[model samples]
Target: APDREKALELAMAQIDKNFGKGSVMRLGEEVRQPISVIPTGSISLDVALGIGGLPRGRVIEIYGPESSGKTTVALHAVANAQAAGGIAAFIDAEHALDPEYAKKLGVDTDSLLVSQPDTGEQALEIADMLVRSGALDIIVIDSVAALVPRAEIEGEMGDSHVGLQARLMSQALRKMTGALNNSGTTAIFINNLREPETTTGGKALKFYASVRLDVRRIETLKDGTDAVGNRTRVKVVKNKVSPPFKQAEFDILYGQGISREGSLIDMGVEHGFIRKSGSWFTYEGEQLGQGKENARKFLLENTDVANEIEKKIKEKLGIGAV
Candidate 1:
């Protein structure tokens, strides 16, 4: 067995070899390079991880059940990378990349290069090509589960039928991941959760993944109501530089962006009563969200008292105005 000190020395030596002698001078200096900064899309989630931003030249797996904010987070990261003047690529094996959804998510659709291959093999080939091109800052394999063969039918059909498909699919996934990472490209592998029993099967793809994040939906109250809603909790199952088994939670907002509570009022409310001096009055108030029309309307309807109230709310919430 390797002694603890010997293991520590080996780890330190590996770091020094890659980062140079004075790399640890400032402490946690592994992030000093012009690395690809892949955002998790949730501001609070990014901050919780101490990464400030997702580290570049790494593969980050975001796995979850259906509608658990996997695609939403991936798109959000794409938008952030594009906003930072970086190129992004999406390898869609399931033909699930909706252009309208991308537009609504505020992603620069032009900056995103998408591949909707008919088969998993084609998708992997395209992904490998994209990574080797060196133009993509972030490459996302929309899902790993779609590429892997389904075990359900395999178990029912018999061992021989299952073994061949499993072996082929596993090999393909490993090759794709290895090619992407070998090119120093940031890869986001989105995985769909399998049944509890299936997760136990020994698989090559599972072993090859650098960072495996398991996202699960937890029920939580919304607006103090007994509303059962889905919030994505990410558990970092594997990581090279950070502690494994770390987790963070982020709520999902559909069709609209998340803003500070009551900042919604600042953006403007249509056909709603505004409280003035403890009195309720109806006003076609300006919306207090994003875009010029909303901002203009908000500025027109906002009074001194309303501004003060907004300030107070910001102070209480510890969030800046949208």
Candidate 2:
């Protein structure tokens, strides 16, 4: 018998001649590489994502009830991108974007592109433009729920605007997916959850999103009777690039972003950076004190320990490069 390579090349040539150039590829040459990712800035969340962060060249949907840290997480990704010299844009349909807050979150408001479109078509169009231009590294539409189609915006209040948003979304997402394929832009769509199991943009957003994160507030963190922060759980409800249903919980303080101290401790405990005995926690062979709060304070005060722990955790998570 002749060599298998020769037979395979001949078969591929025949198919290509009939169909088009590069129509057929060898099965042995097929290998699926992992997608590139940007950190969401929460170590636990990054680990749960399995790829260390949100994947580029895809759509990520984050939806949940009020104050679930949906926008907080999105802004963190934006901050990370900007800090790494990548451009980012935010489509603010809600008109609720607080520039001061965003700045505090580490988003470079001056360099960041901010647009508030009057209609749903306009927002998606801007997204498409940015995606196609290759000028931006990531874009966030905050959010899908707030997008009002042109038809609905111009129509009367009771003029039957039903399904307009969904229709528009279906069309927009179809185009978005084509443009996003193999591109460097990571488009994040923030959504709001409605009671009775529905997201504002209807089914199209869910169907097109590569990853869907459902965030919910678990408890409020109080300091001396004042609400300092809240504990939020981010559940990866749907993920195309990684294992779905994995979850990560973290704290979001009022003024600060994700609590770095808290995350370090979380990572420390998980990866054995911090050892626990009875109720006490030990770091570097020395007892920090009892309770997680004490461990958190230790991390907060000792910058070297925290940095080393973060470095170690990143190495173990395989996210050190990113």
Highest lDDT among the candidates is held by which one?
2
Model 2, 131-238: lDDT tens digits are 888778889998677787887788668657577788888899898877886567899998877451255465888888878898999988863366778999999888
lDDT of 1 by residue, 1-322 (tens): 8799788877777886895432333234333233345667654455334354465666677777877777777787787777778888998877787767777767888767888766556666778788877777788887665664444423455544545344654666566656566666777777766452222222554665556667777754254344533456777666554434556665554453322223334322321333332222323342343432234345446665456544554344333332
In candidate 2, position 82 carries an lDDT of 88
Which lDDT values do the candidates have, in the order given? 0.58, 0.81
Lowest summed lDDT window (length 10), candidate 2: 25-34
Model 1 poorest 10 in a row by lDDT: 270-279
